[PDB]
Amino acid sequence: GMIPLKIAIAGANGRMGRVLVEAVNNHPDTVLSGALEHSGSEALGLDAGYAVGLKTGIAISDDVDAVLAQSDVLIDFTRPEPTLKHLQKCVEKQVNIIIGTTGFDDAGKAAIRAAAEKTGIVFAANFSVGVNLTFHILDTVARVLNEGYDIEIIEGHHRHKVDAPSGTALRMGEVIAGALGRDLKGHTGPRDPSTIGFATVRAGDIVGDHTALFATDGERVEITHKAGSRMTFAAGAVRAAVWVNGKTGLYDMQDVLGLN
Amino acid sequence: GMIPLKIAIAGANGRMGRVLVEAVNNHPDTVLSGALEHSGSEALGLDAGYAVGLKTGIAISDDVDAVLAQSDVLIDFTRPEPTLKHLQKCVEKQVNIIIGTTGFDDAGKAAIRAAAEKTGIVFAANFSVGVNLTFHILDTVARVLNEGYDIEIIEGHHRHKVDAPSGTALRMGEVIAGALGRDLKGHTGPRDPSTIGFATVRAGDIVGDHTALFATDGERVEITHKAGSRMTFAAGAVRAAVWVNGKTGLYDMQDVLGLN
Amino acid sequence: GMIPLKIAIAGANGRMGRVLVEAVNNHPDTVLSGALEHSGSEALGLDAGYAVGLKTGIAISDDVDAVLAQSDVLIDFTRPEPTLKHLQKCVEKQVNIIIGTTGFDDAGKAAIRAAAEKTGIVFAANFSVGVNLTFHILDTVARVLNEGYDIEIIEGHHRHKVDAPSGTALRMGEVIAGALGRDLKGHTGPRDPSTIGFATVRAGDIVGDHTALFATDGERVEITHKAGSRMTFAAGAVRAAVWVNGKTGLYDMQDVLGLN
Amino acid sequence: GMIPLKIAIAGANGRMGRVLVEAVNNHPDTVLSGALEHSGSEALGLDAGYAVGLKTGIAISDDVDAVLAQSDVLIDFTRPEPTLKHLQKCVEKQVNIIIGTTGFDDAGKAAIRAAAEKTGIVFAANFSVGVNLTFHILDTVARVLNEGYDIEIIEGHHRHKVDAPSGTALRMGEVIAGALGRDLKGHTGPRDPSTIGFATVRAGDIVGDHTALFATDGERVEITHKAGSRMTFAAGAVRAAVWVNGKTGLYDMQDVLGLN
């Protein structure tokens, strides 16, 4: 597509969907061209920006074919089943797709791989630019600080969060353990292999703080990500939409960010 | 005693003792008049400041009677048994005593109480001015934030530390639980009683960081103490020496700080 | 009023108003009974919770008399002029009022004082429970740490914030300077009066972080408030509504929190 | 040299020298073989570890030729003039040299370059492993976060520190500005070039904290170094000694750490 890129948002009335509308609004190379919901949504017919203070001119719709016909890229952070119906239609209409939906098993992932032969896809477990950058720099840090350091993955989340450690924290752990030549799960001297541990805070409504702490005698290095809202994932999803414009293939956020 | 106050340091060659020598040096109302070690110390006869860059003129000595005869106050962060021998001599010589030694049981504590009838004593589990202030303000904070908050006591210590949570963290917990009308050890709504938990980091050579985190929807309050070295305990011990000058009785750091 | 307390929200379509709707929803002793906007609002006739996922049954209205007639308390974080029209009607209808509106000069403040003879008012520069608690504990901290400490007020705010230091930071400064017996604006030894300074970070979309750092040789004490969203002010405004129920008079957040 | 590597320490009685003695003691591949001071030092004839609790068997000496004759590497964090006398003798005796001394101008740097033709040298402005790693990762971070972020270099130091921002902070700035294609010294949208600023805290006896904060809408990334003591520089200097064993040439800490 020509600039500006015409973006459609699935699940436009959900929490991710609203922030995505704002993310499309903030990026100067994109415009909102569609906003999808299922046929039961209380929000059908409302302006896509009604809950975030924007007049987009785009009525929230359940007409998937009509929306895709006038869009260049669909951004989808919904559930696996509806995402894969949207996928088939993107393929048919030659629309790119940014899949932030998680929870696919082997057969869902195969479906995504197959469609990537025919359209541009960015499929990532996490769309935060900062998080993905953290995963990348942690490999380097852990290689250099491979002896003599105690390594702790510290995370803070909202009270009712079920998974401890979070998926992000576990990934940070896997990157570090990998860089140390190890598999995940006294005094550490200068030639002792650096050690890994996890600490978890569950409190209030914390969106998510993740710190990798590398500590030795006389120093601490801390690599920290702090999420203030879902805008971090939304902004990275829109960056990915812009990046994958004009491409066919299966990409991830490492590709988007020019890493590895 | 007249100013300047003449301070003697027990265990002058240990880690606390050296920092105490520096603490006496830094405070303008005090001077070093004695520095005690046991008869086996490699440091007998050396200047008390030999390891901290100071020329005090005070030879490290094992002559307890001679040192006490020319001092106004003894500061002692050693072990219970030698501390209680020093106690008897302070009583005899009318010297005040700042007891930072920990690990007394009921009979040691009774001995301290008895001697406080005859000399000035400050006996505290912790001599850090900041820590004791933290214990005091936590009562207030927890009373006001008694509903609706998730409370977490987070601490960082050096790798080989045995006790988790630390004694300081446990005290912070007891103060908070007490303020909530409770005994120590889902979503918290605005009228739900505030909850307490502990998180522990063991890494590197961290002297000790303690945070009490109070979290609710939309906000965090954090009350934090960071120890950079043993100087925090030493400086509070010297403040206590100055405070207890001219007094007889058993006092603690709440007294020294004018709290409660 | 009987429980549940019937709350009306002014400026219901603004940023504070939406969060207030959520705050009334979360508190079990309150219910939403009115939601006011001016006659030009695009949101007249919409459900008060339309932008925050709640079905309140309350249509956003411009009928001030009708709304006040069926409410016990109005919460108002709007502008001085419209707030003072609402004030007159609260007086007439015997409705309490929580004034979070700022920017009153001497004549506005006199108007609020006068109406407090006839209805219950809580009027505070800041409705965050944590912030007001911070202002209170800082007095104590600064009294105890009155000699020997370097004191720094550190704040982080969103990029385009105009005022540096923020009003909160300046208040923290005034409380501290006051506790030190001073007026606002080398090595600090143990008997030197503690010193005050300010540091400011302007970056991203940070809602607001405020830290008072007290530092000396060997230790740091940090008293920190972190705002994650406007819910902190909204939740404190609803606490104040509940507190002032059954009272006549002019109160502030120190009263609400049982402080001083 | 064979393992264990025989290390000599210049300025053995200074602050860096003492920590270096401890660093040599902690590393299992090194042993202390000499400890140098000038002819006026009060510490001549004392054991090199007298102030740090170690019995090294090495008398602090002013006999530079004798010490170098029995050592493989000299570690020197002293002053330019005495360092360059030591340099000439290392060249003569075929001893490697780790130069942590700073403040050389063009002619001193030329002298170091010349001697590197004849012996192994590691010459770095900063020997902290964590700091040098930070400088390296900041290039990557700033390249990826090149648009849309506000970047702040925040540092904390002891009260009487003269230089603001510190040399480390200025270097962090130069690395970032360089990565952004710029020279050092409103709302930042997603395609706006990321901006740089500095904030400085002067307080207490803080050894040195440095944070690079990258902030945008919805997220913060923080890359932080915290120095607890001079051991961080000392430990990196000993790592460099071990690394440069068996080499001739001029190297820096990027080389030691296997970076670039």
mmCIF file of C-alpha atoms in Angstrom, chain B:
data_model
loop_
_atom_site.group_PDB
_atom_site.id
_atom_site.type_symbol
_atom_site.label_atom_id
_atom_site.label_comp_id
_atom_site.label_asym_id
_atom_site.label_seq_id
_atom_site.Cartn_x
_atom_site.Cartn_y
_atom_site.Cartn_z
ATOM 1 C CA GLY B 1 31.404 14.170 80.660
ATOM 2 C CA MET B 2 32.319 17.546 79.228
ATOM 3 C CA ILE B 3 32.426 17.917 75.490
ATOM 4 C CA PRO B 4 34.259 16.596 73.714
ATOM 5 C CA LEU B 5 32.947 13.208 74.785
ATOM 6 C CA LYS B 6 35.692 10.657 75.247
ATOM 7 C CA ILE B 7 34.697 7.469 73.439
ATOM 8 C CA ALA B 8 36.085 4.005 73.790
ATOM 9 C CA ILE B 9 35.445 1.321 71.109
ATOM 10 C CA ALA B 10 35.344 -2.448 71.880
ATOM 11 C CA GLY B 11 36.392 -4.927 69.179
ATOM 12 C CA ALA B 12 38.330 -2.147 67.622
ATOM 13 C CA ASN B 13 39.930 -4.345 65.046
ATOM 14 C CA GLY B 14 36.667 -5.906 63.764
ATOM 15 C CA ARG B 15 34.540 -4.627 60.932
ATOM 16 C CA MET B 16 32.200 -2.640 63.193
ATOM 17 C CA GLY B 17 35.127 -1.364 65.235
ATOM 18 C CA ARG B 18 36.914 0.216 62.329
ATOM 19 C CA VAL B 19 33.836 2.033 61.165
ATOM 20 C CA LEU B 20 33.185 3.200 64.703
ATOM 21 C CA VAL B 21 36.689 4.727 64.802
ATOM 22 C CA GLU B 22 35.735 6.673 61.649
ATOM 23 C CA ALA B 23 32.340 7.631 63.099
ATOM 24 C CA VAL B 24 33.996 9.032 66.280
ATOM 25 C CA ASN B 25 36.425 10.903 64.019
ATOM 26 C CA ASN B 26 33.640 12.468 61.920
ATOM 27 C CA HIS B 27 31.478 13.691 64.803
ATOM 28 C CA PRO B 28 32.714 17.088 66.096
ATOM 29 C CA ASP B 29 31.541 16.526 69.673
ATOM 30 C CA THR B 30 33.474 13.288 70.224
ATOM 31 C CA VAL B 31 37.099 12.114 70.436
ATOM 32 C CA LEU B 32 38.566 8.639 70.567
ATOM 33 C CA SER B 33 40.034 7.813 73.989
ATOM 34 C CA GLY B 34 40.373 3.999 73.815
ATOM 35 C CA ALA B 35 40.299 1.053 71.492
ATOM 36 C CA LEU B 36 39.957 -2.409 72.888
ATOM 37 C CA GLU B 37 40.815 -5.830 71.606
ATOM 38 C CA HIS B 38 41.265 -9.233 73.261
ATOM 39 C CA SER B 39 44.861 -10.415 74.233
ATOM 40 C CA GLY B 40 45.266 -12.525 70.984
ATOM 41 C CA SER B 41 44.605 -9.757 68.526
ATOM 42 C CA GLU B 42 47.315 -9.238 65.930
ATOM 43 C CA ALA B 43 46.522 -5.504 66.260
ATOM 44 C CA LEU B 44 47.550 -4.821 69.847
ATOM 45 C CA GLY B 45 49.821 -1.860 69.952
ATOM 46 C CA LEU B 46 48.756 -0.508 66.537
ATOM 47 C CA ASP B 47 47.100 2.918 66.199
ATOM 48 C CA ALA B 48 43.284 2.489 66.289
ATOM 49 C CA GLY B 49 42.975 4.168 62.967
ATOM 50 C CA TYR B 50 45.754 2.199 61.174
ATOM 51 C CA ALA B 51 43.310 0.519 58.730
ATOM 52 C CA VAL B 52 41.153 3.599 58.049
ATOM 53 C CA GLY B 53 43.806 6.323 57.389
ATOM 54 C CA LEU B 54 43.681 8.128 60.729
ATOM 55 C CA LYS B 55 46.249 8.972 63.294
ATOM 56 C CA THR B 56 44.354 8.778 66.509
ATOM 57 C CA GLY B 57 47.193 8.420 69.003
ATOM 58 C CA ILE B 58 45.318 5.624 70.604
ATOM 59 C CA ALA B 59 47.088 2.264 70.721
ATOM 60 C CA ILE B 60 44.766 -0.716 70.461
ATOM 61 C CA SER B 61 44.933 -2.189 73.966
ATOM 62 C CA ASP B 62 43.704 -5.185 75.996
ATOM 63 C CA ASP B 63 43.764 -3.221 79.242
ATOM 64 C CA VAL B 64 40.045 -2.835 79.830
ATOM 65 C CA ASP B 65 40.362 -1.069 83.225
ATOM 66 C CA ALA B 66 42.881 1.454 81.948
ATOM 67 C CA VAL B 67 40.839 2.362 78.867
ATOM 68 C CA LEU B 68 37.571 2.694 80.840
ATOM 69 C CA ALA B 69 39.270 4.841 83.469
ATOM 70 C CA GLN B 70 39.952 7.483 80.841
ATOM 71 C CA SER B 71 36.692 7.279 78.817
ATOM 72 C CA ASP B 72 33.122 8.589 79.262
ATOM 73 C CA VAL B 73 31.306 5.983 77.095
ATOM 74 C CA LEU B 74 32.096 2.578 75.602
ATOM 75 C CA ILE B 75 30.551 1.578 72.216
ATOM 76 C CA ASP B 76 30.384 -2.267 71.909
ATOM 77 C CA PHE B 77 29.218 -4.295 68.845
ATOM 78 C CA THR B 78 31.015 -7.536 69.732
ATOM 79 C CA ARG B 79 29.544 -10.756 71.220
ATOM 80 C CA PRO B 80 27.276 -11.209 74.266
ATOM 81 C CA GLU B 81 29.864 -12.734 76.590
ATOM 82 C CA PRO B 82 32.643 -10.210 76.222
ATOM 83 C CA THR B 83 30.048 -7.399 76.188
ATOM 84 C CA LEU B 84 28.729 -8.408 79.530
ATOM 85 C CA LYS B 85 32.280 -8.378 81.079
ATOM 86 C CA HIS B 86 32.686 -4.868 79.677
ATOM 87 C CA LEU B 87 29.313 -3.978 81.172
ATOM 88 C CA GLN B 88 30.379 -4.847 84.709
ATOM 89 C CA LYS B 89 33.462 -2.596 84.342
ATOM 90 C CA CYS B 90 31.407 0.295 82.929
ATOM 91 C CA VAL B 91 29.169 0.026 85.961
ATOM 92 C CA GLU B 92 32.189 0.051 88.267
ATOM 93 C CA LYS B 93 33.871 2.959 86.520
ATOM 94 C CA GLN B 94 30.675 4.961 85.903
ATOM 95 C CA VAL B 95 31.076 4.805 82.080
ATOM 96 C CA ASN B 96 28.002 4.820 79.786
ATOM 97 C CA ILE B 97 27.645 1.997 77.261
ATOM 98 C CA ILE B 98 26.107 1.718 73.784
ATOM 99 C CA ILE B 99 25.291 -1.965 73.208
ATOM 100 C CA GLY B 100 24.975 -2.869 69.575
ATOM 101 C CA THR B 101 25.823 -6.497 70.299
ATOM 102 C CA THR B 102 22.919 -8.715 69.427
ATOM 103 C CA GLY B 103 21.998 -12.305 70.358
ATOM 104 C CA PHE B 104 21.262 -11.857 74.037
ATOM 105 C CA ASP B 105 18.650 -14.148 75.509
ATOM 106 C CA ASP B 106 16.489 -13.437 78.596
ATOM 107 C CA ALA B 107 19.322 -13.597 81.178
ATOM 108 C CA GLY B 108 21.604 -11.211 79.151
ATOM 109 C CA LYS B 109 18.745 -8.719 78.782
ATOM 110 C CA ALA B 110 18.119 -8.865 82.522
ATOM 111 C CA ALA B 111 21.780 -8.096 83.166
ATOM 112 C CA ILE B 112 21.565 -4.999 80.871
ATOM 113 C CA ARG B 113 18.357 -3.806 82.649
ATOM 114 C CA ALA B 114 20.021 -4.132 86.005
ATOM 115 C CA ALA B 115 23.112 -2.175 85.063
ATOM 116 C CA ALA B 116 20.879 0.621 83.663
ATOM 117 C CA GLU B 117 19.986 1.519 87.198
ATOM 118 C CA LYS B 118 23.649 2.589 87.645
ATOM 119 C CA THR B 119 24.823 3.946 84.319
ATOM 120 C CA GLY B 120 23.513 5.273 80.975
ATOM 121 C CA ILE B 121 22.798 2.606 78.384
ATOM 122 C CA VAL B 122 21.433 2.637 74.927
ATOM 123 C CA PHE B 123 20.634 -0.956 73.841
ATOM 124 C CA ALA B 124 19.040 -1.372 70.395
ATOM 125 C CA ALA B 125 18.709 -4.209 67.881
ATOM 126 C CA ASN B 126 19.633 -1.760 65.155
ATOM 127 C CA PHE B 127 21.622 1.499 65.366
ATOM 128 C CA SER B 128 20.886 2.805 61.883
ATOM 129 C CA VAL B 129 19.095 6.101 62.215
ATOM 130 C CA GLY B 130 17.292 5.526 58.913
ATOM 131 C CA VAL B 131 16.172 2.002 59.775
ATOM 132 C CA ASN B 132 14.692 3.007 63.127
ATOM 133 C CA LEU B 133 12.970 5.942 61.483
ATOM 134 C CA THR B 134 11.522 3.556 58.887
ATOM 135 C CA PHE B 135 10.126 1.290 61.616
ATOM 136 C CA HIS B 136 8.411 4.362 63.125
ATOM 137 C CA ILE B 137 6.916 5.738 59.949
ATOM 138 C CA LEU B 138 5.689 2.351 58.846
ATOM 139 C CA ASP B 139 3.222 2.290 61.759
ATOM 140 C CA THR B 140 1.675 5.511 60.494
ATOM 141 C CA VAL B 141 1.663 4.427 56.891
ATOM 142 C CA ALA B 142 0.077 1.141 57.583
ATOM 143 C CA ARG B 143 -2.689 2.710 59.736
ATOM 144 C CA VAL B 144 -3.695 5.064 56.948
ATOM 145 C CA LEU B 145 -3.282 2.509 54.164
ATOM 146 C CA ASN B 146 -5.136 -0.133 56.288
ATOM 147 C CA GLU B 147 -7.716 -1.010 53.602
ATOM 148 C CA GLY B 148 -7.320 -1.578 49.919
ATOM 149 C CA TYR B 149 -3.511 -1.971 49.661
ATOM 150 C CA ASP B 150 -1.246 -4.907 48.959
ATOM 151 C CA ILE B 151 1.850 -4.584 51.092
ATOM 152 C CA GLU B 152 5.129 -6.201 50.138
ATOM 153 C CA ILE B 153 8.398 -6.223 52.103
ATOM 154 C CA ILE B 154 11.196 -6.504 49.567
ATOM 155 C CA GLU B 155 14.786 -6.980 50.546
ATOM 156 C CA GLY B 156 18.115 -7.348 48.844
ATOM 157 C CA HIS B 157 21.215 -8.936 50.554
ATOM 158 C CA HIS B 158 24.608 -10.412 49.792
ATOM 159 C CA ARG B 159 24.628 -13.923 48.331
ATOM 160 C CA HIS B 160 25.711 -15.939 51.342
ATOM 161 C CA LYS B 161 23.300 -14.276 53.846
ATOM 162 C CA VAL B 162 21.685 -17.162 55.911
ATOM 163 C CA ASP B 163 18.487 -15.523 57.335
ATOM 164 C CA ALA B 164 15.600 -14.819 54.795
ATOM 165 C CA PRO B 165 13.741 -12.593 55.390
ATOM 166 C CA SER B 166 16.362 -10.524 57.309
ATOM 167 C CA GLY B 167 15.708 -9.399 60.867
ATOM 168 C CA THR B 168 15.094 -5.907 59.638
ATOM 169 C CA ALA B 169 12.511 -7.172 57.121
ATOM 170 C CA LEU B 170 10.793 -9.249 59.826
ATOM 171 C CA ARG B 171 10.653 -6.223 62.104
ATOM 172 C CA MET B 172 9.160 -4.119 59.274
ATOM 173 C CA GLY B 173 6.571 -6.914 58.920
ATOM 174 C CA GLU B 174 5.773 -6.961 62.669
ATOM 175 C CA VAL B 175 5.334 -3.192 62.750
ATOM 176 C CA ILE B 176 2.964 -3.341 59.763
ATOM 177 C CA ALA B 177 0.982 -6.348 60.977
ATOM 178 C CA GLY B 178 0.716 -4.680 64.347
ATOM 179 C CA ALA B 179 -0.562 -1.449 62.818
ATOM 180 C CA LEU B 180 -3.200 -3.512 60.903
ATOM 181 C CA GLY B 181 -4.375 -5.177 64.145
ATOM 182 C CA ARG B 182 -3.010 -8.563 62.955
ATOM 183 C CA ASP B 183 -0.315 -11.178 63.723
ATOM 184 C CA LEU B 184 2.523 -11.842 61.296
ATOM 185 C CA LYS B 185 2.247 -14.846 58.935
ATOM 186 C CA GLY B 186 -7.521 -12.135 44.660
ATOM 187 C CA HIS B 187 -8.147 -8.397 44.148
ATOM 188 C CA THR B 188 -7.952 -6.164 47.273
ATOM 189 C CA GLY B 189 -10.909 -3.758 47.076
ATOM 190 C CA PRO B 190 -11.125 -0.338 48.784
ATOM 191 C CA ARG B 191 -12.735 -1.686 51.992
ATOM 192 C CA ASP B 192 -10.768 -4.999 52.116
ATOM 193 C CA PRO B 193 -8.077 -5.185 54.890
ATOM 194 C CA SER B 194 -4.623 -4.582 53.380
ATOM 195 C CA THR B 195 -2.517 -7.724 52.915
ATOM 196 C CA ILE B 196 1.231 -8.400 53.674
ATOM 197 C CA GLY B 197 3.859 -10.480 51.737
ATOM 198 C CA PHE B 198 7.758 -10.819 51.534
ATOM 199 C CA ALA B 199 10.198 -10.981 48.620
ATOM 200 C CA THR B 200 13.927 -11.690 48.922
ATOM 201 C CA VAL B 201 16.872 -11.098 46.552
ATOM 202 C CA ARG B 202 20.231 -12.871 47.428
ATOM 203 C CA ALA B 203 23.011 -11.538 45.113
ATOM 204 C CA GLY B 204 26.574 -10.209 44.985
ATOM 205 C CA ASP B 205 27.705 -8.267 48.055
ATOM 206 C CA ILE B 206 24.637 -6.023 48.614
ATOM 207 C CA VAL B 207 24.998 -4.558 52.165
ATOM 208 C CA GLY B 208 21.278 -4.373 52.527
ATOM 209 C CA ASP B 209 18.306 -2.735 50.736
ATOM 210 C CA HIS B 210 14.795 -2.870 52.401
ATOM 211 C CA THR B 211 11.598 -1.566 50.762
ATOM 212 C CA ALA B 212 8.071 -1.557 52.061
ATOM 213 C CA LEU B 213 5.782 -1.279 49.020
ATOM 214 C CA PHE B 214 2.124 -0.294 49.502
ATOM 215 C CA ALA B 215 0.200 -0.774 46.255
ATOM 216 C CA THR B 216 -3.336 -0.168 45.157
ATOM 217 C CA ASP B 217 -5.154 0.692 41.927
ATOM 218 C CA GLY B 218 -3.401 3.690 40.445
ATOM 219 C CA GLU B 219 -0.578 4.131 43.047
ATOM 220 C CA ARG B 220 2.439 2.894 44.826
ATOM 221 C CA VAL B 221 3.997 4.224 47.986
ATOM 222 C CA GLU B 222 7.494 2.949 48.702
ATOM 223 C CA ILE B 223 9.412 3.472 51.916
ATOM 224 C CA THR B 224 13.065 2.454 51.245
ATOM 225 C CA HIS B 225 16.266 2.079 53.219
ATOM 226 C CA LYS B 226 19.550 1.539 51.466
ATOM 227 C CA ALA B 227 22.713 0.698 53.507
ATOM 228 C CA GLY B 228 25.940 1.604 51.611
ATOM 229 C CA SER B 229 28.272 0.334 54.364
ATOM 230 C CA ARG B 230 28.411 -0.319 58.083
ATOM 231 C CA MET B 231 28.813 3.427 58.629
ATOM 232 C CA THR B 232 25.101 3.735 59.026
ATOM 233 C CA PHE B 233 25.111 1.662 62.208
ATOM 234 C CA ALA B 234 28.304 3.260 63.474
ATOM 235 C CA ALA B 235 27.066 6.879 62.958
ATOM 236 C CA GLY B 236 23.778 6.028 64.842
ATOM 237 C CA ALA B 237 25.819 4.445 67.689
ATOM 238 C CA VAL B 238 27.852 7.648 68.026
ATOM 239 C CA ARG B 239 24.635 9.772 67.954
ATOM 240 C CA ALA B 240 23.400 7.569 70.775
ATOM 241 C CA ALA B 241 26.581 8.109 72.797
ATOM 242 C CA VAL B 242 26.177 11.857 72.483
ATOM 243 C CA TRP B 243 22.455 11.656 73.378
ATOM 244 C CA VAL B 244 22.839 9.514 76.475
ATOM 245 C CA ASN B 245 25.577 11.786 77.913
ATOM 246 C CA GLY B 246 24.513 12.897 81.365
ATOM 247 C CA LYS B 247 21.810 10.260 81.778
ATOM 248 C CA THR B 248 21.274 7.064 83.772
ATOM 249 C CA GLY B 249 18.784 4.536 82.595
ATOM 250 C CA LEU B 250 17.915 2.042 79.832
ATOM 251 C CA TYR B 251 17.167 3.661 76.500
ATOM 252 C CA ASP B 252 16.683 2.571 72.930
ATOM 253 C CA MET B 253 16.972 4.228 69.483
ATOM 254 C CA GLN B 254 13.320 5.470 69.619
ATOM 255 C CA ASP B 255 14.467 7.521 72.623
ATOM 256 C CA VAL B 256 17.632 8.752 70.877
ATOM 257 C CA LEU B 257 15.546 9.889 67.870
ATOM 258 C CA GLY B 258 12.823 11.554 69.959
ATOM 259 C CA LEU B 259 10.138 9.233 68.586
ATOM 260 C CA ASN B 260 6.911 7.850 70.169
#
